[PDB]
């Protein structure tokens, strides 16, 4: 009586694990080369279905991470190698001793000062201390002037050049220099070869979205209770393409996120305690960074005929520094409250036991926030900021770190290890002129780690890759498979 028959055109699907197409609006380089134009269609429809969603175990987020990284690698690949520059450089001794690259025992320094010196210093748009790049506590940049002999395309002819390095970019040979001209090399040359990131990478924003190929579709959670891992999502929204993603790579605080909503959300890894905390846009949190001084850039033709961008500054500017604006105190209070009330949190009772904290260790890639402003990477020591936003009783943090400020000192570094799991060291060309960037702050990257009902430790993290799971994350890719089978009586003849 009941035969299988074939039902074609059936509204059903299964998990897909395939590549997606990218589409963009910025078509200056990589866009025209690799991506479809953005169609402008951001519409979506809802279904009365239940589906399982997981931000960490996703194919959509996995492609975002690997694709951003891969387009970086294919952009740098053809640029000039700097191994011809790994020669002894002759550096000003007072500068290498002053900033700790080399040693001297003839400085016999001794300081007597007031110990009751902690101050509170607030800055905002309407202030001359910002316009003139001089706020209480800001020091000089720490740039070291070094000379070296470099050969261009004439081969049997060479010239000496003036290159000023940031102090963190040099190693410097130590011991028995009783004169001048210390002997220095680039910090990461010898274990590897440094390549210059010549094709304007990071000088502008990279934004793109993913589109499903024919036969595939994207499902998204449209709940408010989505916490990264949700086995039964009741509000499932269907679309053909994802929202636009901002491929921003910064540690501690994520900038310019697309998921900027009037709500604090905390995604949680299902199997771990690593989380991405969005911030409530209601408070207009913003970070305005400046790199003081007017730079000169001097292209140098080296051996192969490719050009390297040198930095003959011949000056002594103030430190790069950053100013935090918006209602930071209140945005942080909401984060602490959101954690206390969260489904996966079984820790403390009060927000007076919940604190933001730096990761420990002596490793600069975690102890300092890294922010990319138009091509120059800016590591920033944030103790002043944290003391202020948390309104901490500092007291015993040692005299330079005991201040409460809404700005922090920072220091430019040109040889940066790639953010992805590569380990490659690249050189960032300097930008000419002065630099200013004004970013929104949309997320906090941190682990939540408590072992008792007192002290929660929101520990800032440097895994930049976790940020891509806030940009997407709520998407699932599915295959439409419209063939069904079901018992029925209607067989042919």
């Amino acid at each position, epitope marked *: 009586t009941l035969y299988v028959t074939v039902f074609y055109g059936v509204p059903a699907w299964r998990n897909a694990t395939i590549p997606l197409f990218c589409a963009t609006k910025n078509r200056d380089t990589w866009g025209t080369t690799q991506c479809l134009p953005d169609n402008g269609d951001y519409s979506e429809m809802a279904l009365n279905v239940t589906e399982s969603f997981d931000a960490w175990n996703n194919t959509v987020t996995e492609q975002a991470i690997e694709d951003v990284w891969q387009l970086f690698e294919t952009s740098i690949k053809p640029c000039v190698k700097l191994s011809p520059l790994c020669i002894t450089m002759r550096c000003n001794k007072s500068e290498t001793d002053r900033w700790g690259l080399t040693k001297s025992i003839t400085t016999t320094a001794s300081t007597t000062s007031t110990t009751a010196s902690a101050k509170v210093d607030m800055v905002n748009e309407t202030s001359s201390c910002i316009a003139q790049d001089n706020c209480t506590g800001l020091e000089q940049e720490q740039m070291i002037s070094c000379k070296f002999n470099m050969t261009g395309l004439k081969r049997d002819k060479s010239k000496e050049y003036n290159e000023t390095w940031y102090s963190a970019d040099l190693v410097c040979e130590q011991g028995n220099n009783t004169g001048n001209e210390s002997r220095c090399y680039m910090n990461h040359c010898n274990t590897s070869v440094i390549q210059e990131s010549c094709d304007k990478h990071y000088w502008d924003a990279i934004r793109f979205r993913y589109c499903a190929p024919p036969g595939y579709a994207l499902l998204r959670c449209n709940d408010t209770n989505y916490s990264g891992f*949700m086995p039964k999502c009741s509000k499932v929204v269907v679309s053909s393409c994802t929202r636009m993603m901002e491929t921003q790579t910064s540690t501690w605080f994520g900038f310019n996120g697309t998921r900027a909503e009037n709500r604090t959300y905390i995604y949680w890894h299902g199997r771990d305690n690593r989380t991405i905390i969005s911030l409530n846009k209601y408070y207009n949190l913003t970070m305005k960074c400046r790199r003081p001084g007017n730079k000169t850039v001097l292209p140098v033709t080296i051996m192969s005929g490719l050009v390297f961008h040198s930095q003959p500054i011949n000056d002594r500017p103030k430190q790069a520094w950053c100013w935090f604006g918006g209602k930071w105190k209140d945005a942080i209070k909401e984060v602490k409250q959101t954690i206390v009330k969260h*489904p*996966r949190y079984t820790g403390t009772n009060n927000t007076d036991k919940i604190n933001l904290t730096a990761p420990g260790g002596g490793d600069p890639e975690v102890t300092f926030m890294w922010t990319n402003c138009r091509g120059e990477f800016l590591y920033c020591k944030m103790n002043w900021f944290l003391n202020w936003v948390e309104d901490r009783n500092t007291a015993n943090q040692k005299p330079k770190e005991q201040h409460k400020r809404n700005y922090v000192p920072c220091h430019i570094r040109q040889i940066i290890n790639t953010w992805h799991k590569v380990g490659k060291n690249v050189y960032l060309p300097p930008r000419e002129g002065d630099l200013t960037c004004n970013s929104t702050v949309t997320s906090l990257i941190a682990n939540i780690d408590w072992i008792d009902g007192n002290q929660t430790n929101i520990t800032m993290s440097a895994e930049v890759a976790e940020l891509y799971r806030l940009e997407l994350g709520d998407y699932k890719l599915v295959e439409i498979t419209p063939i069904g089978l079901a018992p029925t009586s209607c067989k042919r003849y």
Partner: antibody
Amino acid sequence: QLQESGPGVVRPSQTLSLTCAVSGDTVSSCCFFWTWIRQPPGKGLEWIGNIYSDNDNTNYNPSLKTRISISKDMSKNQFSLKLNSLTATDTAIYYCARESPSRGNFCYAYLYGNCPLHFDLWGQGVLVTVSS
Amino acid sequence: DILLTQSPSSLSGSVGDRVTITCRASQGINSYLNWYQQKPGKAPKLLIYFANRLQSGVPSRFSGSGSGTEFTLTISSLQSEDGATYYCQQYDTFPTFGPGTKLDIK
């Protein structure tokens, strides 16, 4: 903790109301639901509805979709039912519960199907008869 | 909805014996099944939750396990005080409760 209350006898086509007080705690406490079930004499248990303490959101048994309403009042530490269009089959013991979630590594959202949820705390129960 | 049923509907044994109740579902429940113990004249109380954990305050003689469409409640040694109606609750969606089973005392 949970003390219910209301008329023992109501009439057909009227609206029944039941109000439960929370003692030693409030109705605004985080991550709890104030729920009601019914137990008609001689029958098992039936869930009828749920109001979430941290929001104005409710969840009702579809069989009473147009008949049941739940609200809370933080100034009284009380929550209550209204059941309209009463009939003979609505005779039941009405009970309250807190439905505490098990917060932790097994709770992802305070939703049915996404968090262990159980009625650890129960009230006394009010028997309501619908009659002329 | 999920239809939750129970068996035996009525069972008994002596004080000191081994007693079990089985709950079944028409749909799988991942683990979201609760057990309640209701004695006549009283509100039900939680006995076991999330198909595996004993509710604090409940004697250690009570235990259970289960997954999918089959779950079990066990009393390792029946007490004279355990006569009660035991109910299963699924809360995978819009909780419905099963019919309940009775344990009497012999």
